[PDB]
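To close the section, here is one more complete example, presented without commentary so you can practise reading it yourself. The ligand is calcium ion.
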Amino acid sequence: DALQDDFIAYDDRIKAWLGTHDRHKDFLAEILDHERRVKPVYRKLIGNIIDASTIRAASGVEL
Amino acid sequence: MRSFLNLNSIPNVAAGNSCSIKLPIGQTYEVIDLRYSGVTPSQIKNVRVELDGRLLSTYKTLNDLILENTRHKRKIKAGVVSFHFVRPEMKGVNVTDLVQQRMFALGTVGLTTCEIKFDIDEAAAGPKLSAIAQKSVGTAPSWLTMRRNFFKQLNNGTTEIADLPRPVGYRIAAIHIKAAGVDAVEFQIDGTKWRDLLKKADNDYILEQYGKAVLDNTYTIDFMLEGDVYQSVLLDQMIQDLRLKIDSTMDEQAEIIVEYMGVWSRNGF
Amino acid sequence: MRSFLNLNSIPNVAAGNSCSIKLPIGQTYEVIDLRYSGVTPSQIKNVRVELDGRLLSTYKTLNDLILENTRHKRKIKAGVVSFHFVRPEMKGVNVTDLVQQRMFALGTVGLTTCEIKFDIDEAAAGPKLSAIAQKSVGTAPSWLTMRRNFFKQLNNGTTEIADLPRPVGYRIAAIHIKAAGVDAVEFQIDGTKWRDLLKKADNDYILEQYGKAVLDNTYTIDFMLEGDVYQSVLLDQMIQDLRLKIDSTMDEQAEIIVEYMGVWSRNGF
Amino acid sequence: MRSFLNLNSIPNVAAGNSCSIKLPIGQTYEVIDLRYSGVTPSQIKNVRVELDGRLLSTYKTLNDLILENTRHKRKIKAGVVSFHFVRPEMKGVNVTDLVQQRMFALGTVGLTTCEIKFDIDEAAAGPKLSAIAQKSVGTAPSWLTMRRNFFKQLNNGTTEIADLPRPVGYRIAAIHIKAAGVDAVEFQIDGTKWRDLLKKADNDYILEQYGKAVLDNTYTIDFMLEGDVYQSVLLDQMIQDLRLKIDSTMDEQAEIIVEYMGVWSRNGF
Amino acid sequence: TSVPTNQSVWGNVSTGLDALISGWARVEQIKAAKASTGQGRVEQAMTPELDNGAAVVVEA
Amino acid sequence: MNTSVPTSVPTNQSVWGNVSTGLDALISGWARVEQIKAAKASTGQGRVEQAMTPELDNGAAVVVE
Ligand SMILES: [Ca+2]
Ligand SMILES: [Ca+2]
Ligand SMILES: [Ca+2]
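Output:
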């Protein structure tokens, strides 16, 4: 979970925790991410393709 | 480590009022010390211990809880009455005594509500009630003592009581016959006479022989005299007859107290 | 589950008569409650517990059984005297206390006869005796307490008693010196002084220190003060000397009570 | 088998003298019975139990040892005071009660010196002291009870005591606040309130509820009411705050008695 | 030099101390084994108690 | 219900020192050790060996690394 590099370094120090080695290990965790890329770029192409644009809708019908 | 807590104030403590001791869910209640003043134990009627709205144990009056403790020779103090969920008299057979005693503690884990309801008599001088809890780590309700009340007519001669509830898988620790004219009693299961027609003096001698105190106008049939839970009556789903033969000298209505035991179930006894 | 039975009527209960309590073979007798009236415990002489015609325990008078129970601080009631086969004071070391106590129960399995003989004094006013049995599932006689009687002359000065029976494999729970002028006693085995020359006041203090009651005109050497059976004297076949050094102040006849222990054998002690 | 020995004569027993009970190394001391006369327990000051010159337990006066025994309801006799190393009230959780009690015995194996020092007051009428030892097979000092003395000033209002020694790995069986004006006390560890602000009457009720005797002018916080050693306070290193909140009504100096527990070490507490 | 810093643990649970307590429970059973046999009693008979004795203590 | 723990016979070794020796053969043996002491008595080197042997109550030792 905590990665091999963080585990091996922390495992070497059998006990105790001081200096930057302790602070980094104490407040350690995994990571995620979020950013704009393929989804937003594809949606912009749909807007560019719909220029000057045509009306499309739903709600009417026999119901 | 145990925790001793001063329970929250009991709401609306007044004469003729219906109060309740709502216990916070999460931990285990080994003992609950109830302090009272301006009211007698007999003035605290219909004491009911409820788990999730269901009845666990019932006491006609708080005085019955005082007598319950007196019987086991537990410490009795005026102005205070304790609810001993953990049975101090328990002795282990294949486990330690401590484990056998604590196994009766009132665990609340998984519970939605834990209450101790009761009614304050109208004649109460100036009722004042507070509670203290001796708790420990949380556990499921599990094994609990279920005190049940039954009223039956006794004759002057011989009366037989065979309609006592027999919840499957449960056990019977003891049976207390509250009557003033009981001479001797006999207990049998499926014809087998586990307790011969023992005279009161003889039955009471055996009780005292095991450190128990004889209660006035009561014939106690202790199935756990040694403190061994395995000596109690196991309500086998195969028992055909659970009978009690009472030899009385008076024609009265007896209050039969039955101390049941079993793993508490949301849809059980 | 235990069974409490009203033993069959004792045949021919009268002054100067020799009666017996014949116990039905098959189950285990934990306790036997003997009710008496119209006669004193001292008027019930030569009490002998016999298994298959052989002597197990002996009491000069029923009063010695009352004193035996009093010493352990067991419940004493006038008009009743119990035979405690199961030793309630036992404590387990590698087993539960319950197992260590019940291990002394009088099992009858494999037995041909189980009797409790005694003689009713001629002076008995109007002897009336009945018995109740607290039984449990059948077991072999097995580990039993064997109370033995011995009489020895005690001098004013120092007396030594080294001729006490040493049945191999058996144990000694306690030794009771019944004399009015015993100041101090010393116990040794093979030169080893297990009990220094302890003054009566000092010995009696240790006894009381363990919840025991000091008997009048008696010097008790309790080898099971903690309730641990493995603290008792193990009569090893190699023991060369088992001696008692009594410092008395009177010239009298002492009744030495020795509580032996061992697995009952049809051809043993 | 245990051995009861009449300890060697105590050297120079006289008023104003500083005597010592030097115990022979090799075996285990379960109990030491000290007989006294011509002097009061309060006249036997500064009682110290030393192992290899290091202090184990301390008593301001011999009267504190009498009160220590009285609290547990141990046999008390005038003219004699015992040192109970083996704790008779102990109950086993994963071991037998006997094992849990004997584990506190004073083993001397590996020791160089075992002493019980004390000072005889000058006012002593005609001091006379002797000792008897109840010993068993030799064992290392191992698990021992370490009675420590502390003096703190109390105000009239609230007083907080958080500077109590917290030896790592050790435990706290109980804390005794010796003061005449203590109304209520609260105990907490790291903010956690293990003992709510319990009124004296309520605290004393729980104590008696467990077979303990309430001592005069003392507020006892028993962490081993059930006899379970694992209910005691474990002085874990990560503990940041061990606090005591005392609500007094008087402005006095209290004697705080702390019963520590742990494996005796040549270089430990 | 050595030291510990920052840890986590289950609440109100038995620690390494109870692992030692079992050892004290085991040594009681060892004594009880000697108590059952008369040969165990005779082994204890060769035990004298005096004021002096050999002491040894060192790290390794 | 319960599960019982084992009760058994462990490592207990009773070593009875059965000493059997002929009284007359001992009397000679005790007489032989007297001759050995006499051999030490004749020489001054025997006297000097016994001067290095006193008696004490006990010993002690302490250290750290
Ligand atoms: Ca439970
Ligand atoms: Ca038996
Ligand atoms: Ca110890």
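Once you have examined the tokens, check your reading against these statements. The two ends of chain A are 54 Å apart (CA to CA). The first helix of chain A runs from residue 4 to 12.
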